[PDB]
Design a protein around this ligand. Structure first.
Ligand SMILES: O=C(c1ccco1)N1CCSCC1
Length: 209
């Protein structure tokens, strides 16, 4: 059972801007998603201070980067707080509405796409490099869900029947044909070193077999 939803007009407009604007500095997408992961890990770490049972679904707080040349996917996995169904459908998009509007107003004032994180909508920088983004997530208070969008103005949500995650978020980037450089180990290392050196959680770059 798959539910299809329309993006708010402002968000669909930003996604189309990100997909169709000529902008060569695409590597910043990895910084934005890792920063999103780090924030999610901060959140579950804080909550567990007053309620340690919130870590029963997983004590380890980390980030994994998993390139897959055969599927042409780059997966970013964290064990942060995860998202509920209401987060996926309602809450996060309601917040992203004002940040999207402010980000696009800034881009008219001369700002550039690499500043997207200062507006809280850095996740959409994934569509610099991906034709489709799948998000698998599990929050302690909800079941495991899959969110998915190829832009075009819509996204889907379904309960996920795949491998159970315990807790956290997995962002699967189905990469554009001309963006396979972000599946190379030395490229990913370069980008993490440049942009994410001081993230306060272990970032593990998986090697391909
Ligand atoms: O862009 C959205 C969105 C906008 C409106 C509803 O969801 N999401 C990003 C992936 S995780 C949260 C959902």
């Amino acid at each position: 059972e798959v539910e299809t939803f329309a993006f708010q007009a402002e968000i669909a407009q930003l996604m189309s801007l990100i997909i169709n604007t000529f902008y060569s500095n695409k590597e910043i997408f990895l910084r934005e998603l890792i920063s999103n992961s780090s924030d999610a890990l901060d959140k579950i770490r804080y909550e567990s201070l007053t309620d340690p049972s919130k870590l029963d679904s997983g004590k380890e707080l980390h980030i994994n980067l998993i390139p897959n040349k055969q599927d042409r996917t780059l997966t970013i996995v964290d064990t942060g707080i995860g998202m509920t169904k209401a987060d996926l459908i309602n809450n996060l998009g309601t917040i992203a509405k004002s940040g999207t509007k402010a980000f696009m107003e800034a881009l008219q004032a001369g700002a550039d796409i690499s500043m997207i994180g200062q507006f809280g909508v850095g996740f959409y920088s994934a569509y610099l490099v991906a034709e489709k983004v799948t998000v698998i997530t599990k929050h302690n208070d909800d079941e495991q869900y899959a969110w998915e969008s190829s832009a075009g103005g819509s996204f889907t949500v379904r309960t996920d029947t795949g491998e159970p995650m315990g807790r956290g978020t997995k962002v699967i980037l189905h990469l554009k044909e001309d963006q396979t450089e972000y599946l190379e180990e030395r490229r990913i290392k370069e980008i993490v070193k440049k942009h994410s050196q001081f993230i306060g959680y272990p970032i593990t770059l998986f090697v391909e077999k």
